[PDB]
Amino acid sequence: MKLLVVSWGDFERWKETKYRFGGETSVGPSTLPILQKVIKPDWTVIVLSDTIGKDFSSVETLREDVRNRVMDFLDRIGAGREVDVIIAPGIGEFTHGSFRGSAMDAYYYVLHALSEIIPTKGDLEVHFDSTHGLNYVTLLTYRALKDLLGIAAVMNTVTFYAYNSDPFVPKITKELNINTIETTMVKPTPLSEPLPGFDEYLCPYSMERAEFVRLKGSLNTLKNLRKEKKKLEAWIGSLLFGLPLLFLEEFPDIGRLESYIEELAETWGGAIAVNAEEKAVTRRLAFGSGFGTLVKLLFQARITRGLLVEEPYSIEKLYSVSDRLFRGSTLQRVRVELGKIEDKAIKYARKGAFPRDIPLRDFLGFDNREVSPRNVLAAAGLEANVVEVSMEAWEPKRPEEEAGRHTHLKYTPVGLKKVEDIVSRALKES
Amino acid sequence: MKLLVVSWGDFERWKETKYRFGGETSVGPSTLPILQKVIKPDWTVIVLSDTIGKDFSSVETLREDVRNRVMDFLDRIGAGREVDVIIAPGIGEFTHGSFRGSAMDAYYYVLHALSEIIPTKGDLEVHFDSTHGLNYVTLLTYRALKDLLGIAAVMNTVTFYAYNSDPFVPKITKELNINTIETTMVKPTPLSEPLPGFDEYLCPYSMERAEFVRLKGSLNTLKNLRKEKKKLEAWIGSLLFGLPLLFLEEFPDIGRLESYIEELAETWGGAIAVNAEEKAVTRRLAFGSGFGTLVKLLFQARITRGLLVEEPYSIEKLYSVSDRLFRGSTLQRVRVELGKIEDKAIKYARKGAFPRDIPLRDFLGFDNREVSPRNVLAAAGLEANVVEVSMEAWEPKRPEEEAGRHTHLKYTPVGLKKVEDIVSRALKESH
Ligand SMILES: Nc1ncnc2c1ncn2[C@@H]1O[C@H](CO)[C@@H](OP(=O)(O)OC[C@@H]2O[C@H](n3cnc4c(N)ncnc43)[C@H]3OP(=O)(O)O[C@H]32)[C@H]1O
């Protein structure tokens, strides 16, 4: 999949020029047609600021004014069908209107929009045009894109190319090159941040705290999240620290994460006040870092959801999951720990012994019944005192080959809680 | 240390306005005085393009024209003098002249210049203003700054703030707010690139093949690096994979690294052709990714050099090094491995046994003598067939607290070579 993302300011102001890119030539006010010709993207995303809007009756007459103006220009320059337009929350005081709120809302809003567009299956080739962006919207768009691609790179190959034309001097410029300014193979970066305290999903920008405290208290999301926070952190830690059984046992409910994000996104949009007379938009709520963390969390669940199976979890399944998810010394520790349990399973199978629900410590022949954070993290979450082993009997013929399919691991109810506390806490000390 | 970094375009085109920042206001053509007033940085860096330069006699005349004009603009606005000015190789055809070369030269040059300015000891609070920046210069400066700060964050607490003024509307703007657009605790991200093939330090932009081949074959940097490449990669993987003994034993020679980067940077500078007549700069050589890898490698060696010590390396030293470099399950797996070697050291010390030059295999009482990649990486480099143990004889009084200090690890000659192959190959196979 080839994805073209561009960052746009006030496109109506741009002058007709000739662009050079990919041995080709184009005349027009925008880089977009020549980028689309040379790259042949499967999909185009335009990120714009709502600050170019002039119809001030409401949020919807605002978005409609901006959206119609973008499509007029796209048809005029011949941009095409296969385009999403993200109308991001901008700020400032202009001829036609006044826009007030957190400058950082643009990051959370673009992060939320890109998370619903970037495919969560297969390899990505991502192209990014910074030539026409407002500096802060361009920089926040770049960051939002790179944050999501890093998570995508855990499961798939992701490459990223950035472009910028030469600088335009009004009136004297005829021709501009489109330069390549970045070529990267994006590195796998699982989510490495805990969920924050409950004052950090939505923040008052200009809302009186009576209204804020009442609003915060009326949200299902904040209540349900308090309940689930530690299980979700256990899951984030599972990918960051290399704990493949915890990855499967704590795999999050995607429908619940979606509703959390939707409730927060609509509470934010709900607090947007438009004064038709003053031509003034006030985003009385600001997104917090927690909204960002929930969006990255749902994206990561979507990217890895194809690994999930129903219990029970075999050694063979723990190996295959680990091979997709983990790298470096973390993969190799997983393989050592699974290999020791497998080696033992083989010895039992060779004796026609098929123990069930046996504490891992007895399975391995240990005698330190205390659960240590050190050993939970260092042994890939397969600590002797929190895991139960079951071998489902079969007729062994080549036991070396077979034990792995037929040996299952799970956390004991007590063990799972102690692992959740350990992993959650390790995530917060970072 | 508070470091302020500002991305600037053509400062002579900017108009007088009002800015507000930290309940202050300021009048002038630039955010810089009000940023300096509120933040009170210990040091300021200005990044701009040399494509503002007007004097084409020579490379240095051009940089001199740009530096003199920035220093005059600083006087006019009242910024003062405690500033580095990074004059990045920019690109484009302008009325006053033409600037040709790879657009990615600006990333490598700014990475190199920041790598000599960002303090390599202590915490860092870094402030970044994108307000007045060229889009491409701002993106490449932002990336170079984040890349070096991720390395510094391995040793030190690094916080990052980014700012951007409201957009300026030529005849409507009364006053511009300076917005906060990022507030970050920077995450430790050690170098995770191998050194590339030898075509990727300097690349021809507009340089003929006879010249390039002769130039490439004349560089002692490329010959030396072919030789030290695997040991340098073994060091990079030591931080990435959690191998504290390898981190000490392969700690690079900072003198040689400076010389590699100085030679590549001087060859790049010497390939810049300035035609005074038709006012054209051509940067005949482009920087390759290998140049950036070397700069990041040197910067990581500067950041971690406080941990290095003389050769006897104790379990106690390996714990303290690992506590600064490693996190999460990597850190815990180092402590599991050191702990096992430590417990046997305690048992031997209690009985008056002080084994010298003993294979770790014998020390732990093992025995295959085959070295596996899996076991080297999973046991934090401390594989029983590649490590030698020596305990100093001492009179144990509190052996459980004393054994760690007295118990020394080192790779055997053969063992180190095997570990180098394993770590170099694991670095390359995740790129
Ligand atoms: N067809 C188009 N019509 C209008 N703009 C276009 C078009 N195609 C691309 N652009 C770019 O879109 C942004 C909006 O106009 C501009 O890029 P940005 O990076 O925001 O600004 C570059 C300007 O470079 C100007 N400076 C002109 N000389 C040079 C120079 N020789 N060394 C460095 N900067 C130069 C600067 O004056 P300053 O600092 O006040 O504004 C910058 C344009 O270059």
Ligand SMILES: Nc1ncnc2c1ncn2[C@@H]1O[C@H](CO)[C@@H](OP(=O)(O)OC[C@@H]2O[C@H](n3cnc4c(N)ncnc43)[C@H]3OP(=O)(O)O[C@H]32)[C@H]1O
């Ligand atoms: N004292 C100063 N003198 C001159 N410039 C200053 C000064 N202080 C700050 N600046 C900024 O420095 C860059 C060069 O002048 C400018 O920032 P940049 O982010 O490059 O672009 C501003 C322009 O805002 C334009 N657009 C104007 N309306 C709106 C609008 N209502 N919704 C979204 N964008 C708007 C954008 O369209 P586009 O890409 O053609 O040009 C940009 C200025 O905002």
